[PDB]
Amino acid sequence: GSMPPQLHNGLDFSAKVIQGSLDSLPQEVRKFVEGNAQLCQPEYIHICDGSEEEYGRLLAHMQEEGVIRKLKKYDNCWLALTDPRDVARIESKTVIITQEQRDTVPIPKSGQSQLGRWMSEEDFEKAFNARFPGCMKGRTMYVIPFSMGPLGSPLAKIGIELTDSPYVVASMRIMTRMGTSVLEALGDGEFIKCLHSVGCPLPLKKPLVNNWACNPELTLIAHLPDRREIISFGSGYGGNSLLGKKCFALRIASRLAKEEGWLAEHMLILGITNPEGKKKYLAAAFPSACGKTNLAMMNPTLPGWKVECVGDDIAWMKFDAQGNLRAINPENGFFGVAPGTSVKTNPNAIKTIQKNTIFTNVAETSDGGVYWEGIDEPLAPGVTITSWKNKEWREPCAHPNSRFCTPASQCPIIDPAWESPEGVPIEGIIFGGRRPAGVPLVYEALSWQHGVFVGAAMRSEATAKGKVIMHDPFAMRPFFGYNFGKYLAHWLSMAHRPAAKLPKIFHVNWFRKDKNGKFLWPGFGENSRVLEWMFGRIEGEDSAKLTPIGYVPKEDALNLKGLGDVNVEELFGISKEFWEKEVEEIDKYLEDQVNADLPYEIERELRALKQRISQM
Ligand SMILES: [O]C(=O)C1=N[C]=[C]C2=[C@]13S[C@@]23[S]
Ligand SMILES: O=C(O)c1ncccc1S
Ligand SMILES: [Mn+2]
Ligand SMILES: [Mn+2]
Ligand code: NA
């Protein structure tokens, strides 16, 4: 873009650019970069090109400043350890700004909304002014041009993230498509404006802990959908700082999707091929605490079946002119929870993460390897462990929210269409939650409307003493870009869309325990048997029986060959007393939390379920 006019010498930042050119940027890109540079006062501006050279040098530099360590056991893998105050998304400091609160969250009947956090426009200007002026003093402002989705896909959308964190740059290179080709594709078009800062201008006013710059007290993750802006301050943690992911691809994206006729959801996408050489794509939404990544990369136990991964976290879906629900994975990598990852739980992840992968808050072995709880692999004596707190270890060795951040292209079961610009046709949508009692292994919704209800009704046992069953509709509770009632209405409207081929909707539960606490289902790759049943159902097979909660596998329909005796009686048991309570808790929840914005059809599904249960 062109040089700003000025009476002095404070507005044109061209002389501080150390890679790239303000002149070569599209006009609105320069205005976004230069205006924030005027505000944040970085020492330098680096316009990222996405090259391997850039990446390699940025890593080595972080290595030089003690901010990351090379993991010598592996091929180009790296470890970051954070300030223990900056380890996770902070929901209570995550907000969406709109003129009217009701556009962002429903106004609850009696309680506080659990479905979002609204902040007023005026409150946010004050909060911004108290954080961003001068915040990058002494630092480089990196400019990251990025695409969500395959470059050029009709479903893809472009952002520009400004950040003062090299860690965010490196991770965005993995988790998005980043660099010069994006700028060239963008041209004079529109882009989501993403501004991030760790909130630690130099000279530092407060102690730097573990060489991890952050500002926990002023952490604030804000979304301004009307301005097409995401503005995030004080956290380097991925869900807070990698703005393409939750901020853009769920919060901003879900609101855009509502307005444009598509869906942005917290779903994995997998492709499954059966022994008859037929392949289907499925999407699944489980709470953050559950195992999307494991299901998306499942190694099936059933012979002749194959599972391939399109994505493990976020799906962008649009019914096309032909009525097919086409989906893309808008991301470029996997930002997976490391603990619990083993050759038994996810052998394909184990394979993926030994090259070109950045790990955060895991333990390090003395031979330059990684360790965490649940890795389920012994260490040779001699090999010692440094914890994620940078101390010798024999409390966990890795933070429970520690991560790997790995390229999608490296997954040995990555689907051949995982980057196809047209997306993949979704034929089933799976909801699920961790339920120790009452809820069967699998059931199928009676209708589209019943299925949307099933999404809305999702509950799951929270990670621990005492247990709590929390609501998490569509697995979107932390992620709604707008009023949940209106999101319900948007999903319900798909039934009325000309030509739409509405996928079958299922609900799963791998967690049911019997009368004495015994797991009723062995899980892992045996979950391929559930996927088999769903596959058949989608093909029209007569393999279901009706129950009050929906369809379940009829007698002998579920493939149990090789498993022995399975207590299907208890696993598929439906208790009237459990379901009476369940429907009441769902009622109370929807009435309070959705209130005047609850669609008629969802109230009707509630009444119908109540009625079916009453007739048991
Ligand atoms: O089990 C368990 O855990 C399960 N199932 C189904 C679905 C989902 C889960 S977790 C989540 S989160
Ligand atoms: O909380 C989430 O669902 C999540 N999913 C993937 C990667 C990071 C996060 S913060
Ligand atoms: Mn997620
Ligand atoms: Mn309708
Ligand atoms: Na560190």
Distances (CA, A) of 335 to 59, 248, 592: 18, 15, 34
Spatial CA neighbour of 518 closest among 437, 433, 577: 437
State the distance from the centre of ligand 2 to the C-alpha of 221, rounded, in angstroms. Answer: 15
Q: Is 477 in the pocket of ligand 2 (CB under 6 A)?
A: no
Burial 460-474 (b: 16+ CB within 10 A, else e): bbeeeeeeebebbbb
**DSSP β-ladder status, 442-444 and 504-508:** antiparallel
Does residue 336 contact residue 406 with C-beta atoms inside 8 Å?
yes
Between CA 88 and CA 240 the distance in angstroms is 8
Q: What's the residue count for the chain?
A: 616
In terms of DSSP H, where are the helices of 356-420? none
Between CA 445 and CA 430 the distance in angstroms is 10
Topology (CATH) of 67-89+332-412: Phosphoenolpyruvate Carboxykinase; domain 2 (2.170.8)
Give SS3 for 363: strand
- Cβ atoms < 10 Å from Cβ of 391: 9
Between CA 544 and CA 319 the distance in angstroms is 27
Q: Is 313 in the pocket of ligand 2 (CB under 6 A)?
A: yes
Does residue 281 contact residue 269 with C-beta atoms inside 8 Å?
yes
Burial 44-72 (b: 16+ CB within 10 A, else e): bbbbbbbeeebbeebbeebeeeebbbebe
Give SS3 for 244: helix
Distances (CA, A) of 348 to 322, 331, 419: 34, 18, 19
CA atoms within 13 A on the CB side of 261: 13
Torsion of CA 174, 176, 178, 182, to 10 degrees: 160
Spatial CA neighbour of 316 closest among 304, 331, 303, 334: 331
Distances (CA, A) of 37 to 6, 87, 196, 219: 15, 28, 12, 20
Closest ligand to the CA of 495: 4
Distances (CA, A) of 492 to 342, 416, 495, 538, 586: 39, 32, 6, 20, 18
Closest ligand to the CA of 488: 4
CA atoms within 13 A on the CB side of 471: 21
Experimental method: X-ray
Sign for the pseudo-dihedral over CA of 339, 343, 345, 349? positive
State the distance from the centre of ligand 3 to the C-alpha of 366, rounded, in angstroms. Answer: 31
Is residue 527 part of an annotated ligand binding site? yes
Looking from the CA of residue 335, the nearest atom of ligand 2 is 7
State the distance from the centre of ligand 1 to the C-alpha of 527, rounded, in angstroms. Answer: 11
Q: Which two tokens stand for residue 420?
A: 């196809």
Burial 198-209 (b: 16+ CB within 10 A, else e): bbbbeeeeeeee
Between CA 341 and CA 344 the distance in angstroms is 8
Strand 403-407's sheet: what is its strand order?
69-70, 78-80, 358-360, 403-407, 333-337
Active-site entry in 40, 290, 309, 411 = 290
Given 3-state DSSP classes, what are the helix, strand and coil percentages for the chain, each rounded to the nearest 5?
Answer: 30, 25, 45
Give, using CA atoms, the residue closest to atom 4 of ligand 1: 434
Q: Is 433 in the pocket of ligand 1 (CB under 6 A)?
A: yes
Does residue 263 contact residue 491 with C-beta atoms inside 8 Å?
yes
Q: Which two tokens stand for residue 608?
A: 């119908």
> Matching CATH topology for 13-66+90-261 and 262-331+413-616?
no
Does residue 275 contact residue 305 with C-beta atoms inside 8 Å?
yes
Give, using CA atoms, the residue closest to atom 8 of ligand 2: 239
Does residue 164 contact residue 136 with C-beta atoms inside 8 Å?
yes
Does residue 445 contact residue 538 with C-beta atoms inside 8 Å?
no
DSSP string over 501-525:
-PPEEEEE-S--B-TTS-BS---GG
For a mutational test of ligand 2's pocket, the pick from 172, 175, 243, 245, i.e. the residue with the most ligand atoms closer than 8 A to its C-beta, is 245
Which DSSP category does 298 fall into?
-
Spatial CA neighbour of 312 closest among 349, 359, 262: 349
Q: Go through the chain and list every residue after which a break occurs, taking a C to next N gap over 2.5 angstroms, comma-separated.
A: 394, 464
Stated in angstroms to one decimal place, the resolution of this structure is 1.5
Is residue 397 part of an annotated ligand binding site? no
Is residue 402 part of an annotated ligand binding site? yes
Closest ligand to the CA of 604: 4
Contacts of 406 (CB under 8 A, 6+ apart): 174, 333, 334, 336, 349, 352, 353, 356, 357, 358
Task: State residue 78 phi and psi, 5-degree precision.
Answer: -145, 150
Helix (H) or strand (E) holding 284: strand 279-285
Is residue 559 part of an annotated ligand binding site? no
Spatial CA neighbour of 291 closest among 248, 238, 245, 349: 349
Distances (CA, A) of 320 to 326, 419, 478: 7, 17, 28
Distances (CA, A) of 433 to 261, 567, 609: 27, 20, 19
- The phi-psi region of residue 580 (left if phi > 0; otherwise alpha if psi is between -120 and 50; otherwise beta) is alpha
Give, using CA atoms, the residue closest to atom 3 of ligand 2: 288
Burial 123-151 (b: 16+ CB within 10 A, else e): ebeebbeebbeebbeebbbbbbbbbbbbe
How many helices and strands, by DSSP H and E, does the chain display? 16, 32
Between CA 192 and CA 175 the distance in angstroms is 16
Q: Is 460 in the pocket of ligand 1 (CB under 6 A)?
A: yes
Distances (CA, A) of 524 to 504, 513, 519, 542: 23, 16, 13, 26
Which DSSP category does 248 fall into?
I
- Cβ atoms < 10 Å from Cβ of 256: 19
Spatial CA neighbour of 479 closest among 148, 104, 198: 104
143: β partners: 47, 162
Q: Is 512 in the pocket of ligand 1 (CB under 6 A)?
A: no
Does residue 485 contact residue 479 with C-beta atoms inside 8 Å?
no
Between CA 459 and CA 144 the distance in angstroms is 37
Give, using CA atoms, the residue closest to atom 10 of ligand 2: 239
State the distance from the centre of ligand 1 to the C-alpha of 288, rounded, in angstroms. Answer: 10
Delimit the domains of the chain by residue range. 13-66+90-261, 67-89+332-412, 262-331+413-616
For a mutational test of ligand 2's pocket, the pick from 254, 312, 337, 470, i.e. the residue with the most ligand atoms closer than 8 A to its C-beta, is 337
192: β partners: 159
In terms of DSSP H, where are the helices of 213-286? 238-241, 253-260
Does residue 260 contact residue 246 with C-beta atoms inside 8 Å?
no
Q: Which amino acid is at 254?
A: S
Does residue 313 contact residue 292 with C-beta atoms inside 8 Å?
yes
State the distance from the centre of ligand 1 to the C-alpha of 511, rounded, in angstroms. Answer: 6
Between CA 421 and CA 256 the distance in angstroms is 19
Is residue 246 part of an annotated ligand binding site? yes
Closest ligand to the CA of 512: 1
Between CA 372 and CA 388 the distance in angstroms is 9
Closest ligand to the CA of 334: 2
Is residue 614 part of an annotated ligand binding site? no
Does residue 144 contact residue 180 with C-beta atoms inside 8 Å?
no
Is residue 313 part of an annotated ligand binding site? yes
Is residue 210 part of an annotated ligand binding site? no
State the distance from the centre of ligand 4 to the C-alpha of 491, rounded, in angstroms. Answer: 10
Does residue 481 contact residue 92 with C-beta atoms inside 8 Å?
no
Q: Which two tokens stand for residue 170?
A: 């490196």
Q: Is 440 in the pocket of ligand 1 (CB under 6 A)?
A: no
CATH of 13-66+90-261, one of 3.40.449.10, 3.40.50.2300, 3.10.330.20, 3.40.50.280: 3.40.449.10
Torsion of CA 539, 544, 548, 550, to 10 degrees: -20
Between CA 17 and CA 440 the distance in angstroms is 59
Between CA 13 and CA 35 the distance in angstroms is 9
Between CA 239 and CA 79 the distance in angstroms is 17
Between CA 460 and CA 512 the distance in angstroms is 11
Q: Is 484 in the pocket of ligand 1 (CB under 6 A)?
A: no
Q: Is 511 in the pocket of ligand 1 (CB under 6 A)?
A: yes
For a mutational test of ligand 2's pocket, the pick from 246, 268, 314, i.e. the residue with the most ligand atoms closer than 8 A to its C-beta, is 246
State the distance from the centre of ligand 1 to the C-alpha of 508, rounded, in angstroms. Answer: 7
State the distance from the centre of ligand 4 to the C-alpha of 601, rounded, in angstroms. Answer: 7
Give, using CA atoms, the residue closest to atom 8 of ligand 1: 433
- Provide CATH code, domain 262-331+413-616: 3.90.228.20
Between CA 68 and CA 212 the distance in angstroms is 10
Is residue 516 part of an annotated ligand binding site? no
* Residue 290 appears among annotated catalytic residues: yes
My answer on whether omega of the bond before 225 falls inside 30° of 0, hence cis, is: no
Does residue 141 contact residue 161 with C-beta atoms inside 8 Å?
no
Does residue 573 contact residue 521 with C-beta atoms inside 8 Å?
no
State the distance from the centre of ligand 2 to the C-alpha of 435, rounded, in angstroms. Answer: 21
Does residue 244 contact residue 161 with C-beta atoms inside 8 Å?
yes
Using only C-alpha atoms, what is the Rg of the chain? Answer: 25
Between CA 506 and CA 501 the distance in angstroms is 16
In terms of DSSP H, where are the helices of 202-266? 238-241, 253-260
First to last CA, the chain: 70
Q: Is 265 in the pocket of ligand 2 (CB under 6 A)?
A: no
**DSSP β-ladder status, 459-461 and 469-471:** antiparallel
Q: Is 106 in the pocket of ligand 2 (CB under 6 A)?
A: no
Give SS3 for 413: coil
Q: Is 311 in the pocket of ligand 2 (CB under 6 A)?
A: no
Between CA 399 and CA 16 the distance in angstroms is 38
Does residue 360 contact residue 402 with C-beta atoms inside 8 Å?
yes
Between CA 499 and CA 239 the distance in angstroms is 37
